[PDB]
C-alpha cells in the first residue's frame, strides 16, 4: 500500500454500525477509499488499515473543484 494507482474514494453520508467480523464501523463526514463496488454492498478501508463492508447508501461522490 503506497501512493500509486488511483482507484475510487467516497465519503460517509450517514454513520453506520457493524455487527460482524466482515463489516466495519464508519461515521458521517469521514473520507474512505472504495475497494469493491460490485456487489450490493461496497467494501471500503480506513487509515488504520481495516476494510469492512458498508451500504453504498451512505456513500456520496466526494465532490470537488475539479473542472467539468
CB 12 within 8 A of CB 56: no
Extract the runs of DSSP E, i.e. beta strands, from 1-68: 8-12, 31-36, 41-45, 51-55, 59-60
Method: NMR
Task: List the one residue out of 64, 1, 63 whose CA is nearest residue 35.
Answer: 1
Give 45-61 as a 3 state SS string.
ECCCCCEEEEEHHHEEC
Task: Report the residue count for the chain.
Answer: 68
**What are 54's three cell numbers?**
458498508
Q: For the chain, list the domains and their CATH numbers.
A: 1-68 (2.30.30.40)
Amino acid at each position: 500500500g503506497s501512493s500509486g494507482s488511483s482507484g475510487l474514494k467516497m465519503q460517509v453520508l450517514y454513520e453506520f454500525e457493524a455487527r460482524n467480523p466482515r463489516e466495519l464501523t464508519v461515521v458521517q463526514g469521514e473520507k474512505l477509499e472504495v475497494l469493491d463496488h460490485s456487489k450490493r454492498w461496497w467494501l471500503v478501508k480506513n487509515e488504520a488499515g481495516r476494510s469492512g463492508y458498508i451500504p453504498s447508501n451512505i456513500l456520496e461522490p466526494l465532490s470537488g473543484p475539479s473542472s467539468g
